[PDB]
Swiss-Prot record, chains A, B:
Belongs to the T4likevirus baseplate wedge protein gp10 family. Peripheral baseplate protein that is part of the tail fiber network. Connects the short tail fibers to the baseplate. During infection, the baseplate undergoes a conformational change from a dome-shaped to a star-shaped structure. At this point, gp10 rotates and acts as a lever that unfolds the short tail fibers, which then interact with host cell surface receptors. Involved in the tail assembly. It is found in: Virion. The lineage of its organism: Viruses, Duplodnaviria, Heunggongvirae, Uroviricota, Caudoviricetes. This is Baseplate wedge protein gp10. Induction: Expressed in the late phase of the viral replicative cycle. Homotrimer; disulfide-linked. Heteromultimer with gp7; a gp10 molecule is disulfide-linked to gp7 and the other two remaining gp10 molecules form a disulfide bond. The gp10 trimer interacts with gp11 trimer and with the short tail fiber (STF) composed of the gp12 trimer. Part of the baseplate macromolecular complex which consists of gp5, gp5.4, gp27 (central spike complex); gp6, gp25, gp53 (inner baseplate); gp7, gp8 (intermediate baseplate); gp9, gp10, gp11, gp12 (peripheral); gp48 and gp54 (proximal region of the tail tube). It comes from the Viruses.
Length: 50, 50
């Protein structure tokens, strides 16, 4: 990540956050903690890495 | 930790960070989180005691 990054795709339905469009991560190091959150949501730890 | 300090060690092999010389964790609490990272690197969260 950076270089060729993530492409994060939630499929329709319950959003990860906001408008559900696929999120991308430039952040060089990164680690992704995401849970399905009862209001039909996928939590994402904001800006983080090692 | 604090008090009697830690010693993290990188000896030859791959560098933890930078020069691989042993990095010493002073701080009272600490959380040691490192990976073996394909650029031969062991990255640990700075600060992030418990």
């Amino acid at each position: 990540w950076n270089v060729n990054p993530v492409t994060l795709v939630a499929a329709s339905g319950d959003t990860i956050k906001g408008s559900a469009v696929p999120v991308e991560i430039n952040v060089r190091f990164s680690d992704l903690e995401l849970v399905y959150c009862a209001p039909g949501r996928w939590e994402y730890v904001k800006n983080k890495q090692i």
